[PDB]
Design an enzyme around this catalytic site. Structure first.
Site, PDB file in Angstrom:
ATOM      1  N   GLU A  35      39.649 -32.396 -21.040  1.00  0.00           N
ATOM      2  CA  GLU A  35      39.382 -31.453 -22.163  1.00  0.00           C
ATOM      3  C   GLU A  35      38.423 -30.289 -21.745  1.00  0.00           C
ATOM      4  O   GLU A  35      38.686 -29.127 -22.111  1.00  0.00           O
ATOM      5  CB  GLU A  35      38.870 -32.161 -23.458  1.00  0.00           C
ATOM      6  CG  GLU A  35      39.864 -33.125 -24.239  1.00  0.00           C
ATOM      7  CD  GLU A  35      41.003 -32.499 -25.039  1.00  0.00           C
ATOM      8  OE1 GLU A  35      41.138 -31.253 -25.028  1.00  0.00           O
ATOM      9  OE2 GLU A  35      41.795 -33.261 -25.678  1.00  0.00           O
ATOM     10  N   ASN A  46      43.542 -21.913 -30.791  1.00  0.00           N
ATOM     11  CA  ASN A  46      44.900 -22.392 -31.131  1.00  0.00           C
ATOM     12  C   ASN A  46      45.773 -21.340 -31.836  1.00  0.00           C
ATOM     13  O   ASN A  46      45.256 -20.435 -32.516  1.00  0.00           O
ATOM     14  CB  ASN A  46      44.843 -23.602 -32.060  1.00  0.00           C
ATOM     15  CG  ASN A  46      43.937 -24.693 -31.558  1.00  0.00           C
ATOM     16  OD1 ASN A  46      43.071 -25.175 -32.298  1.00  0.00           O
ATOM     17  ND2 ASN A  46      44.128 -25.110 -30.306  1.00  0.00           N
ATOM     18  N   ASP A  48      47.589 -21.392 -34.630  1.00  0.00           N
ATOM     19  CA  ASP A  48      47.511 -21.292 -36.094  1.00  0.00           C
ATOM     20  C   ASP A  48      46.217 -20.602 -36.558  1.00  0.00           C
ATOM     21  O   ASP A  48      45.975 -20.442 -37.780  1.00  0.00           O
ATOM     22  CB  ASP A  48      47.688 -22.671 -36.770  1.00  0.00           C
ATOM     23  CG  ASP A  48      46.479 -23.613 -36.580  1.00  0.00           C
ATOM     24  OD1 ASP A  48      45.642 -23.446 -35.657  1.00  0.00           O
ATOM     25  OD2 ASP A  48      46.369 -24.552 -37.387  1.00  0.00           O
ATOM     26  N   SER A  50      43.117 -21.695 -35.937  1.00  0.00           N
ATOM     27  CA  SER A  50      41.973 -22.597 -35.787  1.00  0.00           C
ATOM     28  C   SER A  50      41.355 -22.541 -34.319  1.00  0.00           C
ATOM     29  O   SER A  50      41.948 -21.927 -33.408  1.00  0.00           O
ATOM     30  CB  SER A  50      42.367 -24.018 -36.222  1.00  0.00           C
ATOM     31  OG  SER A  50      43.312 -24.575 -35.318  1.00  0.00           O
ATOM     32  N   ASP A  52      39.150 -24.912 -31.047  1.00  0.00           N
ATOM     33  CA  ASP A  52      38.543 -26.124 -30.429  1.00  0.00           C
ATOM     34  C   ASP A  52      37.192 -25.930 -29.664  1.00  0.00           C
ATOM     35  O   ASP A  52      37.023 -24.971 -28.855  1.00  0.00           O
ATOM     36  CB  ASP A  52      39.491 -26.807 -29.413  1.00  0.00           C
ATOM     37  CG  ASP A  52      40.862 -27.204 -30.006  1.00  0.00           C
ATOM     38  OD1 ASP A  52      41.098 -27.356 -31.245  1.00  0.00           O
ATOM     39  OD2 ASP A  52      41.726 -27.410 -29.146  1.00  0.00           O
ATOM     40  N   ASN A  59      38.501 -29.568 -33.560  1.00  0.00           N
ATOM     41  CA  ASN A  59      39.248 -28.461 -34.210  1.00  0.00           C
ATOM     42  C   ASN A  59      38.756 -28.065 -35.659  1.00  0.00           C
ATOM     43  O   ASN A  59      38.420 -28.918 -36.468  1.00  0.00           O
ATOM     44  CB  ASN A  59      40.724 -28.878 -34.188  1.00  0.00           C
ATOM     45  CG  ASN A  59      41.600 -28.028 -35.024  1.00  0.00           C
ATOM     46  OD1 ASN A  59      41.735 -28.257 -36.236  1.00  0.00           O
ATOM     47  ND2 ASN A  59      42.248 -27.054 -34.394  1.00  0.00           N
TER      48      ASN A  59
END
Ligand SMILES: [Cl-]
Ligand SMILES: [Cl-]
Ligand SMILES: [Cl-]
Ligand SMILES: [Cl-]
Ligand SMILES: [Cl-]
Ligand SMILES: [Cl-]
Ligand SMILES: [Cl-]
Ligand SMILES: [Cl-]
Ligand code: NA
Length: 129
Positions: A35, A46, A48, A50, A52, A59
């Site tokens: 990660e 991301n 959409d 959003s 991380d 998220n």
């Protein structure tokens, strides 16, 4: 902060992740390696809209507030910036709510693809724990 391999394994054990909801320490270390490469300052956007955040990439659609995710929730009751600290506490507490939602560590796609089924214990070999 960029953790040494044996250094992060020690901090994750201290905050009670070793076997939380049935998942051993090497599963959490492997998840962090892939990660973030052990870097707390890691972020990624991301499609959409959003975002991380941190050593485990949590998220903003459900879990944290960043003020920029329309129609979203804040189920962890925290700002997303707390997930970037050299202190890993907020990251560990929110990972505990997420892993309890019904789907376990499958909530992290890179855990499912790079660490589910592998010799996860190698990530803690030679460490004083
Ligand atoms: Cl390494
Ligand atoms: Cl392990
Ligand atoms: Cl928002
Ligand atoms: Cl922005
Ligand atoms: Cl909410
Ligand atoms: Cl907030
Ligand atoms: Cl820490
Ligand atoms: Cl499970
Ligand atoms: Na949110």
């Amino acid at each position: 902060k960029v953790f040494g391999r044996c250094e992060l394994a020690a901090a994750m054990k201290r905050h009670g992740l070793d076997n939380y909801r049935g998942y051993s320490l090497g599963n959490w270390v492997c998840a962090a390696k892939f990660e973030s490469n052990f870097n707390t300052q890691a972020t990624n956007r991301n499609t959409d809209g959003s975002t991380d955040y941190g050593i485990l990439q949590i998220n903003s659609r459900w879990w944290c507030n960043d003020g920029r995710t329309p129609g979203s929730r804040n189920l962890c009751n925290i700002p997303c910036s707390a997930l970037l600290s050299s202190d890993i506490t907020a990251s560990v507490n929110c990972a505990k709510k997420i892993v309890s939602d019904g789907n376990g560590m499958n909530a992290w796609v890179a855990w499912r693809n790079r660490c589910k089924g592998t010799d996860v214990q190698a990530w803690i070999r030679g460490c004083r724990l």
